[PDB]
């Protein structure tokens, strides 16, 4: 009764199908916006509590991105910071009890109550937004572009470059597949290993999964902005 | 917290205790911490860095050696 699934739609179809992926995306958006307004409204010169936590998180991210690159850190910070916050909170919400058990209102079709990254559509959307962002900034910075990735041996053999172009193409696919695969495989780990001794056994892999969710958020954001750095140069 | 001594054939430059040494070893730059394993290295013309309570002093060294107890 593991009941593993790749994609679900949880009804909610008033003419337009509203998957439970959208349900969890909206609830996480509500949570993150509530956290944002709670931090911003009580604005103090010396931050404490929740405001201190938010300031520390953005300061750490901004420092990391400046370490990657200094010129485009401010321009590209909104996208990558939203990526990190959104997918991190989705992955962490994927650990709350009720990932599959909720659904008792007929098979137990589930309110997603897990990471929205556990579905292909979310990861593909984030991958394509990242890819179009990278390409737009590559055009803006390099100018005409394609000096490399388009034959034209100029200090580097043209043979390398068709390979770079196809690597550029596969990069969004690799990113989306990495996020989806890690989250979905961790979910299936939790469920399947709960099939075996559901008591006191799932805690180590549970903690491993919360760590993997955080690391996946950070690594996806870092890879996106590092690809921006590669495209600029 | 390690007893650093920049000695020279003419005189002693420093004899204080230091947080970090960014030594320019010949093979590659090496950092040293209060409990570094025993070591003996050849330096190359570079800018050795002394990190003292968050203050960086760039002592340029045109060459020399280093023994790290």
């Amino acid at each position: 009764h593991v009941e593993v699934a790749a994609e679900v739609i949880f009804d909610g179809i008033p003419g337009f199908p509203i998957t439970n992926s959208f349900v969890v995306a909206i609830i996480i958006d509500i949570f993150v916006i509530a956290l944002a307004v709670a931090a911003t409204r009580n604005l103090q010169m010396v931050p404490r509590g929740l405001q201190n936590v938010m300031e520390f998180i953005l300061e750490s991210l901004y420092n990391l991105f400046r370490n990657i690159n200094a010129k485009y850190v401010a321009t590209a910070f909104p996208l990558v910071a939203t990526i990190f916050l959104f997918v991190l909170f989705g992955n962490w919400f994927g650990l709350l009890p009720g990932v599959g058990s909720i659904g008792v209102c007929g098979k137990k079709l589930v309110p997603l109550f897990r990471a929205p990254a556990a579905d292909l559509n979310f990861t593909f959307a984030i991958a394509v937004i990242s890819f179009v962002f990278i390409e737009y900034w590559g055009f803006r910075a390099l100018g005409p572009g394609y000096l490399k990735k388009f034959f034209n041996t100029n200090g580097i053999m043209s043979f390398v470059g068709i390979i770079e172009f196809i690597s550029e193409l596969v990069k969004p696919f690799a990113l989306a597949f990495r996020l989806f695969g890690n989250i979905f495989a961790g979910e299936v780990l939790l469920v399947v290993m709960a099939f075996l001794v559901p008591l006191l056994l799932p805690l180590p892999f549970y903690g491993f999964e919360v760590f993997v969710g955080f690391i996946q958020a950070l690594i996806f954001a870092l890879l996106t902005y590092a690809f921006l750095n590669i495209a600029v140069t | 917290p390690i007893h650093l001594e920049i000695v020279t054939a003419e005189r002693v430059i420093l004899s204080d205790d230091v947080d970090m040494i960014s030594a320019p070893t010949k093979d590659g730059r090496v950092g040293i911490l209060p409990r570094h394993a025993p070591l003996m290295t050849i330096l190359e013309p570079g800018e050795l860095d002394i990190i003292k309570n968050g203050e960086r002093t760039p002592f340029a060294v045109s060459g020399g050696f280093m023994e790290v107890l």
């Binding site: 938010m54 401010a74 910070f77 910071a81 559509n121 394509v128 | -």
Partner: protein, 51 residues
């Protein structure tokens, strides 16, 4: 689950999210950090002017 409808709707949701956070949290936080940094620099300059 590669439906173009869900794909495009999720993309639109993400654009809305990034724009809301940019207009609500990221800009105020960056402004506050830049203000504090320039204020520390001004404090250094003020010590120099005291001397």
């Amino acid at each position: 689950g590669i439906n173009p409808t869900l794909f495009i709707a999720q993309l639109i949701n993400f654009l809305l999210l990034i724009f809301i956070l940019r207009a609500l949290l990221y800009r105020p936080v960056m402004n506050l950090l830049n203000e504090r940094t320039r204020r520390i620099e001004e404090s250094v300059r003020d010590a120099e002017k005291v001397r």
